[PDB]
Design a protein around this ligand. Structure first.
Ligand code: SF4
Ligand SMILES: [Zn+2]
Lengths: 431, 107, 66, 143
């Protein structure tokens, strides 16, 4: 990929001065299209209630689950509404989960408890559930189909159940010369060390073209874009924040000089709290708004970068699922989120969102080629396949303040390589 | 009586001086504006977090997640504490539209 | 009138068009038409032969501090 | 020619008792970055061949590929003067070697090497792509 090509030449720099030194040029970004328009909210009227969201979620997700239960259990179909069930008869039900957990805090670290019930709910009534089903892997808000019978105590006995699955995916055109994309998250400007300072300096010095030989300068010239994904100012306590926007403005100036940059709000960043987070206001960045290479987006970000389509968050859905479930692997939680056809199924019950009423926008309408996450504690990447011809690369971006690691994504081979930065510390090997 | 014939202009967010035009900042306190935007968006952020914890608690006290809430229980603190945050949010959202929009929306 | 005020009160409580006590009446009529559940072409034909009256173009409980 | 920057470095280092990175010695003398690294290597080679016992400390940079557990990572490190060859033998592929800094009296960690670059950036803010090896085209002040 990158470090293979970075040694492909001769080395000139352990030498006395010369007449000329080589220069290069940044590769063109001749196609780009932002398609994150359902997350940019222009009107923003509150004063509705959260019942309009669940109803449109069920009404939109129902035909997918009917069409999958047909070909997953046989076209001798027995799909039936929750009220028209007769005692001890084999049928399929399509509904919404609700997990009834105590230890979840009310108004007046994991939170799973050894006893907690699942309830299948439709628009008119509910029913309890027991049998062969996982009690702690599933969360409230998933829509699914299920197979079984109504027993004598009013409960329901489950044999097997199925999720919605992956959406269709059109193929991408192949590329001629490999272009790279760099992904960073969580610089933590405001607190978090001094080795993080030299790490941030060495990272911007490599990507801008100040560091290393003609190998590194030829290979960093091919990096086409830069994406910064959330949690730019890590905060120690709210009640500091004014002096940090000055330094963030300086860093975005030093990056806006050479590359195009995309900046996203995070868990602590001066924006709203609900989930389609709106872009940062330009009045906090005097210096960096001189150039038209800096762009400010928000939370859920879609794009079409050179044919390859991207979609990502700053890691607020994945940690929310991590709170109220039993899965630990963040790459697994990201793939599970992909499997139920919903970016954030736990919303709104433990993760706040805007009260939409026309259409729920967190249902996947297509399949992305790349799908990344936000502030995960360690690097990971994987390739997964669909039932049809659908392949997806899954990346979890590490957190720069502890690991000092970023990710390079190739746009022609579609692979991801880590990059790590480490200056020497107070290290003396004679003690 | 006279109290209705107000509005059409708002006072400076920095030093409370009534003036003609709709801009939020005063001409003497125009420089310090990034700090005055920084201040009060951490208030909108904390009102947003209080709307959502309350209006979904009624859904769990009611039983259903798919139908409307009707409970005007005068002995519940939940009622009329869920009524005032709508207006706090209504007011604090409109104070930040004094500042322009952070981008376009018709693209 | 007095027969048109029961048709709208019957459209407002049918559960197969949605959970609607926060929005207008014509917005819920167009929401169901987009998804095309089965809106009937009579709850439209009284919301056109009237102006902006608050006892036609409003949900049943548009008072009522809920 | 040579005596110009040789005497400039000999008064910056040993008289004013300062810490000279390559970016400071390229913002002082108005030089390209790679030529500044070559200048520093010239000075250290001359004064280390002359005497062998100077009050001179160096710090280098080593970059290149590695495999920890299967995966190919790319490790970049700013290294002292004792531990260079072991770090060079741990790596798989080598991709960049030059010089980073010189000193008079030995430091304890990588503290002031950020203070120097930060302060010389602080007053020199309208140019950072001026001596950069990559010159993009669409980034010119417009808005
Ligand atoms: S207002 Fe209070 S009592 Fe009524 S449903 Fe809400 S939480 Fe329960
Ligand atoms: Zn003022």
């Amino acid at each position: 990929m990158f470090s293979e090509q970075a040694a492909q030449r001769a080395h000139t720099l352990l030498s006395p001065p010369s007449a000329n030194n080589a220069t290069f040029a940044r590769v063109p970004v001749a196609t780009y299209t932002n398609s994150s328009q359902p997350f940019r909210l222009g009107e923003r009227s509150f004063s509705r209630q959260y019942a309009h969201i669940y109803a449109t979620r069920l009404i939109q997700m129902r035909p997918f689950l009917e069409n999958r239960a047909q070909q997953h259990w046989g076209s001798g179909v027995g799909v039936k509404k929750l009220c028209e069930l007769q005692p001890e008869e084999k049928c399929c039900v399509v509904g919404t989960l609700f997990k009834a957990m105590p230890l979840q805090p009310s108004i007046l670290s994991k939170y799973i408890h050894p006893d907690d019930e699942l309830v299948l709910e439709d628009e008119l009534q509910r029913i309890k559930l027991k049998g062969t089903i996982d009690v702690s892997k599933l969360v409230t808000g998933t829509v699914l189909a299920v197979f079984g019978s109504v027993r004598d105590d009013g409960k329901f006995l489950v044999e097997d159940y199925c999720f919605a699955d992956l959406a269709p995916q059109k193929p991408a055109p192949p590329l001629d010369t490999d272009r790279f994309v760099l992904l960073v998250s969580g610089l933590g400007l405001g607190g978090g060390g001094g080795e993080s300072l030299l790490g941030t300096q060495l990272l911007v010095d490599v990507v801008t073209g100040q560091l290393g030989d003609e190998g590194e300068q030829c290979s960093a010239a091919h990096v086409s874009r830069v994406i910064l994904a959330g949690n730019l100012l890590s905060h120690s306590t709210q009640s500091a924040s004014v002096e940090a926007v000055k330094m963030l403005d300086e860093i975005l100036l030093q990056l806006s000089a050479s590359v195009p940059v995309d900046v996203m709000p995070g868990e602590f960043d001066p924006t709203n709290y609900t989930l389609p987070q709106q872009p940062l206001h330009p009045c906090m960045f005097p210096l960096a708004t001189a150039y038209s290479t800096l762009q400010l987006v928000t939370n859920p970000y879609q794009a079409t970068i050179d044919g390859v389509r991207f979609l990502g968050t700053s890691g607020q859905n994945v940690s929310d699922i991590f709170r109220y479930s039993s899965m630990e692997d963040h790459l697994e939680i990201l793939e599970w989120t992909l499997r139920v056809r919903h970016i954030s199924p736990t919303a709104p019950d433990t993760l706040g969102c805007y009260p939409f009423y026309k259409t729920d926008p967190f249902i996947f309408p297509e399949c992305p080629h790349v799908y990344f996450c936000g502030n995960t504690p360690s690097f990971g990447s994987k390739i997964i396949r669909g039932p049809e011809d659908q392949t997806v690369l899954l990346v979890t971006v590490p957190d720069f303040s502890a690991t000092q690691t970023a990710c390079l994504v190739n746009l022609r081979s579609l692979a991801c390589q880590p990059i790590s930065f480490s200056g020497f510390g107070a290290e003396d090997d004679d003690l | 009586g006279l109290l209705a014939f107000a509005k059409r202009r708002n006072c400076c967010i920095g030093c409370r001086t009534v003036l003609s035009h709709q801009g939020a900042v005063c001409e003497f306190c125009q420089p310090r504006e990034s700090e005055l935007y920084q201040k009060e968006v951490s208030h909108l952020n904390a009102l947003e977090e209080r709307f959502s914890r309350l209006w979904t608690q009624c859904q769990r006290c009611q039983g259903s997640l798919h139908e409307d809430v009707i409970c005007t229980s005068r002995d519940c603190p939940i009622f009329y504490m869920r009524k005032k945050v709508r207006k706090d949010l209504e007011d604090q959202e409109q104070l930040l539209r004094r500042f322009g929009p952070p981008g376009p929306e018709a693209w | 009138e007095e027969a048109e005020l029961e048709l709208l009160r019957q459209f407002d409580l049918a559960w197969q068009y949605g959970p609607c006590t926060g929005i207008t009446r014509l917005q819920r009529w167009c929401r169901a038409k987009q998804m095309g559940l089965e809106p009937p072409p009579e709850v439209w034909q009284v919301l056109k032969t009237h102006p902006g009256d608050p006892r036609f173009q409003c949900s049943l409980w548009h008072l009522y501090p809920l | 020619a040579d005596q110009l920057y040789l005497e400039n470095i000999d008064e910056f280092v040993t008289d004013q008792n300062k810490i000279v990175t390559y970016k400071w010695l390229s913002y002082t003398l108005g030089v390209h970055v790679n030529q500044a690294k070559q200048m520093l290597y010239d000075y250290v080679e001359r004064k280390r061949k002359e005497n062998s016992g100077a009050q001179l400390h160096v710090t280098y940079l080593v970059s290149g590929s590695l495999i920890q557990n299967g995966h190919s990572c790319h490790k970049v490190a700013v290294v002292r003067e004792d531990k260079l060859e072991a770090v060079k033998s741990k790596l798989a592929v080598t991709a960049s070697i030059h010089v980073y800094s010189i000193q008079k009296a030995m430091l304890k960690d990588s503290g002031p090497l950020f203070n120097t670059d930060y302060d010389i950036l602080k007053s020199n803010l309208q140019n950072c792509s001026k001596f950069s090896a990559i010159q993009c085209a669409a980034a010119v002040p417009r808005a």
